[model samples]
Target: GSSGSSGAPAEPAAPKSGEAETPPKHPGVLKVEAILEKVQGLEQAVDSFEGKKTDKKYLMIEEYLTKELLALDSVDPEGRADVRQARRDGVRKVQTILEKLEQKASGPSSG
Candidate 1:
């Protein structure tokens, strides 16, 4: 048996600011939060810009959001039930928001 051996320094897990040391160790919370906040940002953007597609600010957000929506659509979430549930909720909400934007953007045409 070796008399002495070197071991790597074990460090503490990073903590945060504000009150309460709440630990979010689960994978779903972070991802769901990010997606949810993104939706929140879009909601405010859509409303803040008079719900018009002409504005450049919201348009850029919309562009990026469109890309993400596709990526979100790509993954079939058979992994985590909780994560997928939130993901599905976000996806559906985003679609409805897009639809709302679309309906407002175009004028009614008699067919």
Candidate 2:
């Protein structure tokens, strides 16, 4: 006697009742958020420096931003261009702030 199920594939199971299906998030979202958080911290660090360019805290923040920029390059290299550009923009903003600090520190004295 031959069984009817011989060499047949089983059907996929359906979802159970009362269970909500969760949508998948983009892989870049989490990375972008983390980068933004670091940028915010850098902003606060810059503000706390109070025009003291030579401060240890300021230098540490600058180093941190540099390291972050390098790390950003390695994140999702083949991902969306918009996300990559946004990360670049964030780095530029930090660099701009650091440059402004340097300029202000060397600016002419107001008597």
Candidate 3:
């Protein structure tokens, strides 16, 4: 009894046409999106603040936004143009809100 034993490996299947391959979304990208949402909400709240400049809630939001923005830097862009642009726009909005809040805090108070 002679057995034929071929040692050739099987070839990988080719992808079908019109089917584009994409890498799985990274966890960091999701985290960045979540952080961006939170920051945007906080910015809105700050914009609508109708309390004392020393309000603890505003202070807390400022601190949180600072931390979240820093955490965003830890996430890699991964060559995602959409995500990058979203991140850029979100940061600009947050910075604008923060700057306005700071100016309001430092400006002469109307007593």
Candidate 4:
């Protein structure tokens, strides 16, 4: 109650705020390229899907996978807004897959 209020350096309720800009994690272009290549493979599956050639089962999984990838790689983590549309090619592929898949009016349930 004496010198406590009159100290040479009183660390009171301070508001020191100069936060350092933390660095963002970069998974590297290698991984990004790998990501794009993976998407392309999914794209081929989407493209290879005929009326009754390949089992559409693969589509169901890749459908969700592509959606996930879209959100994941929609941009280069630190590349600002530069890579806004690179992954769009897969989106179109997904759209076409859904388009053709929609023609599947009905299919019998599996046990």
Candidate 5:
């Protein structure tokens, strides 16, 4: 709403000239990248699990990812623009990869 005043109507504020807005960094991307770096090691750690014991390691991964996702959601704007959905989607793709690895770790016979 416009401020109601007795003086002449104020001119609208102008955007600063000659500079494009900077994009916000999606925190999820960084988190996912870090996870990706460690996923092979995690997979190796659980490689011995035949079935019954795989749940603990998988659960740990899930919990870590859930916390990272929450962190991503809570991140404040880094600059002028909102977080990019493309960056978020990239992180989601990493999650899908994690799920695939989890499935492989769980063995093909169960699912």
Candidate 6:
């Protein structure tokens, strides 16, 4: 019982088996590009909101916001509440961003 051997130190304990990771999925740079594409689509929607195709513009806004909400929901369940609340807060921010766009559209030099 006196045999002595040097062994590697024990590693730290891992997260519980059922506990989810912070981000359920890691969207790499390409995914980020996709997100930006959605954002650009939203911009186009805002720009065309007063045109003959205004209906399509509102549809695009709904679609983009839906996609963003889904993305925010993809966070870990443990973080879901905070993520959802933040996403709700984002609705107001999106409205603010759109308002700025509207202002720019209202006048040639208003941006």
User: Ten residues in a row with the worst lDDT in model 3?
Assistant: 1-10
Instruction: State which candidate, 5 or 6, has the greater lDDT.
Output: 5
Clashes of 1: 0
What's the best-to-worst order under lDDT? 3, 2, 1, 5, 6, 4
Give the residue spans of candidate 3 off by over 4 A. Answer: 1-29, 50-57, 106-111
Q: Write the per-residue lDDT of candidate 4 for residues 36-72, one digit (tens) a residue.
A: 5565555454444434324566556446545646654
Candidate 1 accuracy as lDDT? 0.55
Clashes of each: 0, 0, 0, 0, 0, 0
Angstrom error at residue 43, model 6:
1.1
How do all models score by TM-score? 0.53, 0.56, 0.55, 0.36, 0.39, 0.33
Give Cα distance to truth, residue 63, candidate 3, Å. Answer: 0.7
What is the TM-score of candidate 6?
0.33
For residues 8-110, write the lDDT of model 5, one tens digit per residue: 3232323344456654434444444444445434444443333432566666655654555555445443452324352364346445535644655556333
lDDT of each: 0.55, 0.56, 0.60, 0.43, 0.45, 0.44
- Residue-level lDDT tens digits of model 1 in 26-66: 44534554565576676555444443466565476577566
- In model 6, which regions exceed 4 Å deviation? 1-29, 51-60, 72-111
Ranking by TM-score: 2, 3, 1, 5, 4, 6
Top of the candidates by lDDT: 3
lDDT of 1 at 55: 58
After superposition, which runs of candidate 1 have C-alpha atoms over 4 Å from their true positions? 1-25, 50-61, 71-76, 107-111
Better model by lDDT, 4 or 6? Answer: 6
**Residue 90: error of model 1 in Å?**
1.0
lDDT (0-100) at residue 102 of candidate 5? 60
Please report how far candidate 3 places residue 99 from its true position, in Å: 1.1
If both were scored by lDDT, which would come out higher, candidate 1 or candidate 4? 1
Off by over 4 Å in 4: 1-32, 51-79, 87-111
User: How does model 5 score by TM-score?
Assistant: 0.39
What is model 3's C-alpha RMSD? 21.4
Better of 2 and 4 by lDDT: 2
What would the per-residue lDDT of candidate 2 be over residues 1-111, giving only the tens digit for each residue? Answer: 111111222323333454468544445644654675676677655544454567665567767766666666656747676666756765666666566445444442323
Which numbered prediction scores highest in TM-score against the true structure? 2
lDDT of candidate 6 over 1-111, digit per residue (tens): 222223232323333446556533323322333344455566555554452223554455656655654553443334454444544444444454355444434432312
